[PDB]
What we know:
Radius of gyration: 22 Å
Subcellular location: Cytoplasm
Organism: Homo sapiens (Human)
Largest sheet: 5 strands, mixed
Number of domains: 4
Keywords: Calcium, Cytoplasm, Disease variant, Metal-binding, Phosphoprotein, Repeat, Transferase, Ubl conjugation, Ubl conjugation pathway, Zinc, Zinc-finger
CATH class of the largest domain: Mainly Alpha
Helix content: 40-55%
Strand content: 5-15%
CATH architecture of the largest domain: Up-down Bundle
Oligomer: monomer
Shape: globular
Number of helices: 14
Number of strands: 10
GO molecular function, one term: ubiquitin protein ligase activity
Bound molecules: ligand Z3N, zinc ion
GO cellular component, one term: plasma membrane
Amino acid sequence: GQAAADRRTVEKTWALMDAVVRLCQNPKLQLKNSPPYILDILPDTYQHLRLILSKYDDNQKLAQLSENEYFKIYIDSLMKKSKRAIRLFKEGKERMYEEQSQDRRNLTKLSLIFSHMLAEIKAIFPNGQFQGDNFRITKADAAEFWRKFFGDKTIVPWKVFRQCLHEVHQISSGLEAMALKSTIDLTCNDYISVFEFDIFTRLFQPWGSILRNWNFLAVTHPGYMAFLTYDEVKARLQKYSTKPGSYIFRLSCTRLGQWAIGYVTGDGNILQTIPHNKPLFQALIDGSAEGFYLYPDGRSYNKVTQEQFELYCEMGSTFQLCKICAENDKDVKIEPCGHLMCTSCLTAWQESDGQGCPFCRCEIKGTEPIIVDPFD
Ligand SMILES: C[C@H]1CCCN(Cc2cc3c(c(C(F)(F)F)c2)CN(c2cccc([C@]4(c5nncn5C)C[C@@H](C)C4)c2)C3=O)C1
Ligand SMILES: [Zn+2]
Ligand SMILES: [Zn+2]
């Protein structure tokens, strides 16, 4: 059985979440209002988990929840990300109190992850009852791909998902697979939920050209600003208040799967809109043709490089993966150049007579084992 281990894991989960909440209540942080608001999200997550348990009343129901693969992965993921937030405060020290620090950007990355996890658990356990197996994917052709490979599965490991997706839409390099992972795996748990799949396929519709749409709208488009608040959109566009047709487009924590566009009017007002019954690309060319959307991020704009994939990857939390394969963790440092990669890729390059370091071609005088954090 798992009864007693399961009881222990839930209670450790709530202890670790309470620990993160207490560290975040430090007035020296000034994040009481800085949203996604970790001091709202973690209590809301606790609240939804209690609602789930409130519905899985007794020994027999609790045993069904125990056997739910999505629920097991969710609680494990919540424990790991809580431990990570604790470690960030222990290792970050007074840098947690500097707004611009890498340590504080990492707290923002964990806050976004917690926000996405709360949206996902509400989508999969609406009113605290499992509905993963009945989840209706928004885009018909995306929904057919998920039925075809995964049936009524709620969640699939990233490695399995990447292999099945590659059957229909070829993924090119390691840096593209890594960039794609960072886009679909919002919860950063190395799984793709049916919910995550729904969000990605809604944003980058149509399905027929989905990797080209994502490459063009997110990976290389100068107008794309990832997740922003309404206040951040005003702050960025204010710099172009005197150049009407200046625009950006962005994601919303509070409205997963939807785009929002901000633009500068003839009067220098900043307005925001959500594309109305059209995909983003159509909204952008239509608004372009009408004079609203002329200057992405305040400049004119007139098939993706490895460098462009690598720059996109830095926004996320995937620094532990080897850039060559995007499968194995970085476990070796090449010396003296200091480039990082997995042993497997190092071997394959020196196997096939590659000069020196795969990245910089320089003499390899030494290697040293290394553990790289996803947030490094
Ligand atoms: C909602 C508000 C909260 C306060 C911070 N601002 C600005 C900001 C945006 C992102 C981030 C930060 C910070 F954590 F690094 F600091 C800061 C991180 N971040 C982020 C984290 C993981 C993945 C991604 C996506 C992405 N977009 N371009 C590249 N990548 C990997 C968007 C997903 C569909 C894939 C983006 C922001 O959007 C956003
Ligand atoms: Zn590798
Ligand atoms: Zn090198």
